Amino acid sequence: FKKVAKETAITLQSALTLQAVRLISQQLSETNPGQAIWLGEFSKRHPIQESDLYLEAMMLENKELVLRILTVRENLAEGVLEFLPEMVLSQIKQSNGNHRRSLLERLTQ
Amino acid sequence: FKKVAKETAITLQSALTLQAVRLISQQLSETNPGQAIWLGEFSKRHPIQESDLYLEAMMLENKELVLRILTVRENLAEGVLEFLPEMVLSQIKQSNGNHRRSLLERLT
Numbered sequence: 001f002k003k004v005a006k007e008t009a010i011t012l013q014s015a016l017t018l019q020a021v022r023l024i025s026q027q028l029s030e031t032n033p034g035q036a037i038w039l040g041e042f043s044k045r046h047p048i049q050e051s052d053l054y055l056e057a058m059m060l061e062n063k064e065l066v067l068r069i070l071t072v073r074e075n076l077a078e079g080v081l082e083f084l085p086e087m088v089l090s091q092i093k094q095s096n097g098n099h100r101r102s103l104l105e106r107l108t109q
Numbered sequence: 110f111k112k113v114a115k116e117t118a119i120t121l122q123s124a125l126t127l128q129a130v131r132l133i134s135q136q137l138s139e140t141n142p143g144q145a146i147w148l149g150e151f152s153k154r155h156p157i158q159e160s161d162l163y164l165e166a167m168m169l170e171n172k173e174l175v176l177r178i179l180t181v182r183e184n185l186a187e188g189v190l191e192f193l194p195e196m197v198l199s200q201i202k203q204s205n206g207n208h209r210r211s212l213l214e215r216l217t
Contacts, residue, residue, distance in 0.1 A: 001188030004128050008189060009196040011124045015117050016201065055208055063212055070205045077201050080114040081194035087114070088121045092186050095122065095161060096179045103168050103175060 016080070017051040020073035024065070039065070125189075126160045129182035133174075147171075 021043065028036035042061065046054045058066045130152065137145030151170070157163045167175050 001185060004125075004132075004185055005189045005192055005196065008121070008124055008128065009193060009200060012117065012121065012193065012197045013200055013204070015120045016197070019113050019117065052204065052208075056211070059212055059215060063216070066208065066212060070208060074201055074205055076113055077198055079110060080117060081198055083111075083114055084118055084121065085190040085193060087118045088125070089183075089186050089190055091118060091122050092125070092183050096183055099161075099164055099168075099175065099179055102165075103172055106168065107172070 012081075014049050014051040016077050017054070017069070017073050018048040019076055020069050021048060023072055023076075024068060035062075035065075038062070121190075121193075123158050123160045125185050126163070126178065126182045127157045129178050129185055130157065132185070133177060133181055148174075 021039070025036055025039055025043075028039060038061075042058065046057045048054050055066055055069065058069075130148070134145055134148050137148060151167060155163050155166050164175050164178065
């Protein structure tokens with residue numbers, strides 16, 4: 001259970017980053033929508049999956065926004081990371097259960 | 110506050126499944142690679158990012174494997190999920206810092 005710890009954390013990071021870029025997109029829609037469009041199309045040219053390339057990339061077009069994302073992305077993180085393990089594990093079990101119960105019923109019938 | 114918390118948790122769920130399917134694929138290559146090759150061939154036609162569907166699919170083609178993934182993905186979860194909130198907050202803080210220097214440097 002070694003490299004998994006790291007690789008997963010990175011996914012999470014990009015996750016929270018996208019998740020931030022998702023709020024900021026909505027707020028933008030209301031306030032400045034010319035920006036909200038830009039953000040969209042820019043999020044089409046650059047995979048949020050690779051977050052750091054993504055942010056650095058933005059630095060050339062919207063320094064101000066890079067910054068906002070950085071804070072939003074950190075807040076959400078605070079507000080969420082702790083509640084996650086007692087939640088993912090739960091769902092894993094519930095998902096694991098339903099799969100096995102349905103995989104065994106399919107054999108039996 | 111939490112619609113987020115949910116979606117991330119779904120992502121992690123997907124995430125770990127993938128990570129398990131990887132760890133199993135590795136084992137199969139060192140052993141039963143005729144079927145390690147099959148796993149490549151399956152993972153190709155189906156989106157692992159929607160897990161509960163990737164599995165249901167494989168059910169209808171190789172039951173023994175679905176069952177093993179579920180077993181493996183849950184071991185994984187137990188053995189990693191705790192050191193996670195601490196690892197990600199840390200990394201996010203370390204990145205945010207690095208990105209701000211870089212940005213505020215690039216300004217002048």
